[PDB]
Design a binder for this molecule. Structure first.
Ligand SMILES: [Cl-]
Lengths: 193, 177
């Protein structure tokens, strides 16, 4: 997939199905979500997850003009897998403002230290926040957009059902590479061409 | 806000619950919204002292260099006598939408302006914060209770100047020497 303005429901048509969509997409995300320790969450993004977010943004902001719709499509384009990469939203979650505030400082650069490993191939580190200019990218955020680029040997093994593991080697958030749910890895394999 | 004025970890820990309550109350006279997605907090010695103590507490910092570092980090946010200083937050219904908005909002800080009565607007100058430098005429009018308005003329976030609640404006005037 890519998505275009014609891929989207109007505000009226979405509002009619919104509650049903919240449930449909929650169910879908069971095949797309991974936790990394107690405070990091990754959602691997696909047509379903991205279309929903766009619908949600348009609904809440009440956006129905053509340039405004297009601007949300273009804002969410970073999440679209392209054939050779998995895309994920990383969220850092802490119980309170002071805790979160302290964590975000301590965890600076964590979005660059999350890695995947398909079977025994070389690990692949996320490339984060390429949609943000250098200065914006340097400001911390509880939310990052990640890209994991996979080569041919990794694509073959993943589609063949090999184990997929995720880790982090940030000094303040060391997570030993651990196998992802095979049902989730199977869903991810389908994103790749 | 001096070095000798900070509380030890032990002393702050004793007052922390009460201080939270007191600062939440205080921030009600300091916070201003610009449209639906921008939230400013006008900083003063009360909000900045609270922030320092919170970070010393949470990270358990009791070494001199570390304590002095936290102070150095926040001391720039304390108004200097002829100025107002605010921290800006961008806020959406959830955090993923906020992140999806950030690229469009680049440069928003430079486009936030205040206007004291019918004086010229003052644009913010870009721990990040917004610094609004007031001229003597503006300082006097504000102190004397004139209207204070705030807006934004960023191309992705055009918000017409709106008057700030008079109780908040009164608090801000007290920052001025
Ligand atoms: Cl002050």
């Amino acid at each position: 997939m890519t998505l275009t303005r014609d891929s989207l429901l109007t505000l009226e048509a979405y509002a009619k199905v919104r509650r049903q969509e919240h449930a449909r997409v929650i169910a879908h995300k069971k095949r797309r979500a991974v936790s990394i320790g107690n405070h990091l969450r990754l959602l691997f993004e696909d047509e379903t997850t991205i279309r929903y977010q766009i619908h949600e943004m348009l609904h809440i902001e009440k956006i129905f003009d053509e340039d405004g719709i297009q601007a949300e499509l273009d804002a969410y384009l970073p999440l679209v897998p392209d054939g050779s990469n998995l895309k994920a939203t990383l969220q850092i979650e802490y119980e309170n403002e002071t805790q979160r505030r302290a964590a975000l400082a301590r965890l600076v650069g964590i979005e660059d230290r999350v890695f995947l490993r398909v079977d025994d191939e070389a690990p692949v580190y996320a490339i984060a926040d390429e949609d943000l200019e250098r200065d914006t990218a340097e400001k911390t955020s509880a939310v990052h957009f990640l890209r994991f680029e996979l080569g041919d040997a990794m694509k073959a093994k993943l589609k063949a059902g090999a184990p997929l593991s995720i880790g982090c080697d940030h000094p303040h958030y060391p997570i030993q590479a651990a196998r992802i749910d095979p049902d989730v890895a199977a869903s991810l394999a389908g994103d790749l061409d």
